[PDB]
Curated annotation (Swiss-Prot), chain A:
Participates in pre-mRNA splicing. Part of the U4/U5/U6 tri-snRNP complex, one of the building blocks of the spliceosome. This is U4/U6 small nuclear ribonucleoprotein PRP3. Present with 432 molecules/cell in log phase SD medium. The chain holds residues 217 to 261 of 469 of the full protein. Component of the U4/U6-U5 tri-snRNP complex composed of the U4, U6 and U5 snRNAs and at least PRP3, PRP4, PRP6, PRP8, PRP18, PRP31, PRP38, SNU13, SNU23, SNU66, SNU114, SPP381, SMB1, SMD1, SMD2, SMD3, SMX2, SMX3, LSM2, LSM3, LSM4, LSM5, LSM6, LSM7, LSM8, BRR2 and DIB1.
Swiss-Prot record, chain C:
It comes from the Eukaryota. It is found in: Nucleus. This is Pre-mRNA-splicing factor 8. The gene is PRP8. Functions as a scaffold that mediates the ordered assembly of spliceosomal proteins and snRNAs. Required for association of BRR2 with the spliceosomal U5 snRNP, and the subsequent assembly of the U4/U6-U5 tri-snRNP complex. Functions as a scaffold that positions spliceosomal U2, U5 and U6 snRNAs at splice sites on pre-mRNA substrates, so that splicing can occur. Interacts with both the 5' and the 3' splice site, as well as the branch region. Has a role in branch site-3' splice site selection. Associates with the branch site-3' splice 3'-exon region. Also has a role in cell cycle. The lineage of its organism: Eukaryota, Fungi, Dikarya, Ascomycota, Saccharomycotina.
Swiss-Prot record, chain D:
Promotes the association of the U4/U6.U5 tri-snRNP particle with pre-spliceosomes to form the mature spliceosomal complex. The gene is PRP31. Component of the U4/U6-U5 tri-snRNP complex composed of the U4, U6 and U5 snRNAs and at least PRP3, PRP4, PRP6, PRP8, PRP18, PRP31, PRP38, SNU13, SNU23, SNU66, SNU114, SPP381, SMB1, SMD1, SMD2, SMD3, SMX2, SMX3, LSM2, LSM3, LSM4, LSM5, LSM6, LSM7, LSM8, BRR2 and DIB1. It comes from Saccharomyces cerevisiae (strain ATCC 204508 / S288c). Belongs to the PRP31 family. Present with 1260 molecules/cell in log phase SD medium. Interacts with the snRNP via the Nop domain. The coiled coil domain is formed by two non-contiguous helices. This is Pre-mRNA-processing factor 31. Residues 17-48 form a coiled coil. It is found in: Nucleus. Transmembrane segments: none annotated.
UniProtKB/Swiss-Prot annotation, chain G:
It is found in: Nucleus. Participates in pre-mRNA splicing. Part of the U4/U5/U6 tri-snRNP complex, one of the building blocks of the spliceosome. This is U4/U6 small nuclear ribonucleoprotein PRP3. Present with 432 molecules/cell in log phase SD medium. Component of the U4/U6-U5 tri-snRNP complex composed of the U4, U6 and U5 snRNAs and at least PRP3, PRP4, PRP6, PRP8, PRP18, PRP31, PRP38, SNU13, SNU23, SNU66, SNU114, SPP381, SMB1, SMD1, SMD2, SMD3, SMX2, SMX3, LSM2, LSM3, LSM4, LSM5, LSM6, LSM7, LSM8, BRR2 and DIB1. The chain holds residues 366 to 466 of 469 of the full protein. It comes from Saccharomyces cerevisiae (strain ATCC 204508 / S288c). It comes from the Eukaryota.
Amino acid sequence: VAHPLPEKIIKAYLTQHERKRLRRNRRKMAREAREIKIK
Amino acid sequence: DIGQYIASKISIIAPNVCFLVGPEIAAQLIAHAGGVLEFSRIPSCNIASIGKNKHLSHELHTLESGVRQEGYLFASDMIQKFPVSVHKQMLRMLCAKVSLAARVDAGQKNGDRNTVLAHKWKAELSKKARKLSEAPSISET
Amino acid sequence: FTLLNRLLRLIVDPNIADYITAKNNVVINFKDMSHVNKYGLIRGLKFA
Amino acid sequence: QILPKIVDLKRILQQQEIKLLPFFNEIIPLIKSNIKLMHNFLISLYSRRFPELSSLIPSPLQYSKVIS
Amino acid sequence: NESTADILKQLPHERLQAVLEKIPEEDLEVRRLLSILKKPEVVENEDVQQRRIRLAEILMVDEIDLENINNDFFTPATSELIFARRFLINYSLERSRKRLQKEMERHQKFNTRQELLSRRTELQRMANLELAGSQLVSTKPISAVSLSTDDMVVATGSWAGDLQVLNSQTLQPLTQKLDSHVGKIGAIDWHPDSNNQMISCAEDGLIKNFQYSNEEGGLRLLGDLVGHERRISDVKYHPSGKFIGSASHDMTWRLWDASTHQELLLQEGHDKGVFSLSFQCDGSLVCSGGMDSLSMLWDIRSGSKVMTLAGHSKPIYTVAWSPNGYQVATGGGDGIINVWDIRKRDEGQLNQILAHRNIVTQVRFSKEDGGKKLVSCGYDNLINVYSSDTWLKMGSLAGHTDKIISLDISNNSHFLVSGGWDRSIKLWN
Amino acid sequence: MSAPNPKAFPLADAALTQQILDVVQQAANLRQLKKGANEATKTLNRGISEFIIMAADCEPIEILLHLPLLCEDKNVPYVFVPSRVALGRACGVSRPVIAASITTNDASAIKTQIYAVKDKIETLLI
Amino acid sequence: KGLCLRIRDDGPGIIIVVGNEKSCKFYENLVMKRIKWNEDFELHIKMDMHNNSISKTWEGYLQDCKFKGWFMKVCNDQDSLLRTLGQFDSEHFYSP
Amino acid sequence: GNLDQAELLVTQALQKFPSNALLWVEQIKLFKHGNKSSLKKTIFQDALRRTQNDHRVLLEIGVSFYAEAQYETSLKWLERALKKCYGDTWVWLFRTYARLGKDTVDLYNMFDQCECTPREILLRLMNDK
């Protein structure tokens, strides 16, 4: 006879080395791109 | 007298640390910090200096192991059963696993004290020690 | 050395005697081989 | 007052030989501090006599016996 | 012309730059594709252009496709309970009729001068109070303080899970301290009659019934009470005295029997932890506080939720019940104390004290007199006193260096006892 | 999420957790942050700690459970944050970190933040 | 959001501000620590306000803010003020 | 009694100011019988760095040695406290000398140049130990 009534109801970081690899690999693609575009 | 009394009943008060290092040592350790709590309050880098007798200028000590501080732990079983070159790395590796064990012992209720963390923690130490002693594979010319 | 640190503390203030005593342990390496020098003197040192 | 207390305490620990473990937790730092007070009190006695010994033999027991 | 744009296309920078233009440019759309793809929504410092480039890159590395392809029960049991339910019907009905008859007798006298003077005198006396003395208990803030019915002893638990008893009047040191098997104590309460028993709710999910023996420090366990999985935030006695309510976390407050030490009613219906519990003076209802900010009334004899009350935007910590029986007070981390007069039932509804600041911990009425004064204790370090009709803040009292966990007031209202974070119990005139 | 470990209290919600890990990295750049369970334990004994942050998902969790007991003694606020990997990231480490300690500098620029986060943390100890 | 009131001109008054938690802190820091209420000004004649003071009563959270915008007004009595708050059901915010 | 709460009060008070020279005087007075031998070095360092090291902290370190032992060590701390000067140091100076002896007579002119019965109070405080 008891009623069990019902209940009633971001960002991520990155380190210094990670910054380095992202920046290096980002600058390398662009630079090599300008190299082949010059050739 | 106190220290000898602790070694008898210690398997009750600190079952993990006596499982890793052994009771004759753990009794000396707990005996030093004067409890399980006060010993688990201790950072792991301060644990290796306990058995160290004293430092004096004329002692003339540089070990082949590279150990700067020889404590009650450096005489344990899990260290000196391995070759000499591995000792310096095992202290730092064992000391931590001792501390955590103590930090389990402070949290275990007095009525029921339980292991099975120290089993994994011997597995990691012994295996990782074999690995530290395993030496590189050969390289192609 | 246990005799040297004393004989040196006779002739010299202790800080220099301790330096001279501990400076001779070091570790000795030739390629593969390595040994700590407990006993003999290393005469390759300027003060030797 | 030291010996009647220490004899009663060692006789206490041999008599049972859980509730007394907190009293260990209290008594352990006290023992060490007292040992150091008395050791440092022996150095005060040997400042005139044999001064280097305090540096030579660090531990309180061996120092105390070498005194004897 | 082919080998010219083929090398240019084979190059990774151009291969990414061609993908960059075809992904749409807005904050929420860039963000939505990232959130769906499970990659980090935001990174430390980026302009939305750089975020868009992180779209392009992440699409390139994984070689994943384009955003095109990317996108109530009634449960029979326990007849033995149903007997106790009949008992609560008889008891609470008689007691209720008696209370309301008494109130009717009070409405007859009127004579506004007697009442208005009495209130003013009470307000001056409360504006007088200062602390007589503090004390020490342990090193852990003091989680619970409780006065016995005769107001001759205090009972204090703390975050250490050890409770000790004190002499109310004096406060020099204690009768005896006991260290319970349990770690962290939420609340404690005295049996309404004998003053031979306490009861303690603490973090282990176990509730201890203590036998307080004469002047002896021989406090003895009458029984242990089980069936809470989580920590228990509060425990109370049913004002009849046979039954013991308990409210904890697992969204279940349980109505229990003191004698048999049995679980009777397992109640459900809070979305989150149930932090508080209170019984009506008549023992008719029980009001329940929770972390879901929903104060929830319960008719114990009908097992039926009666009326649900949300005046709070944050967790409800303390639920105090008026000795008059037709009102209720709650308080929570929002720093507001809601007073609900259930009788009026249409519109006056809540009257909400703006209370303290920085939460509210315990709210309490005045036991004798039918209750007028409100004594509330928060983390503002202060303590407030409120009238029961004007609900105007009358006076506030600063004796504490730290925040206040717990408080009681004497039956005769001549001593205000408060523990807190400063680890000192402080007595107030 | 998984079942939040009942032994983990208080557990910061995501709105507060963003603020917490954010002040964490904001501290690390000023090297006002100590990281690790041992290196938080050092800050509690010394008494320079503002508030301790810990991972609620640490397996086993019995290794960090002394820090609540030490913080109650030193009257230091402490919270649990849901995931140890994000806590490791905010500290600037690429590998999980189950405890961190914000130290005390009153001439620091981030003081006002740390006091706000403490005022919100002390709200959850009840 | 919020409102501002007082009693006539020299009469005391109440300030209420609601919103995100970052702005409320900066406005508290405006009223209390920045602005000096005891400081004397020469009104368009000298005025000595040294007795005047500011105090915060409570701070907390709400289900909704019925304030549409922030506005300042002037009430002659203590009643029509409590009705001014009565429009927002805020009548209990004033503490006599 | 119960210096155990005194620890806590030093903490709460000490976080507010923080830099008061006195609060570090009691903080250092705590580790005498405070049974904590691990942190006393550090906090000494800390109490020196946070206080813009002050004659009162210096004095309490010197006394912290002398009370224990190593009367020669506390000479460096007390004498190092003098150079920033004020009567609280001279007593412990004359006690450390009173243990090491023979230097007392030459140091009297310094006590006059720092200034009645001061000379009398000195002989009153030499009779303490």
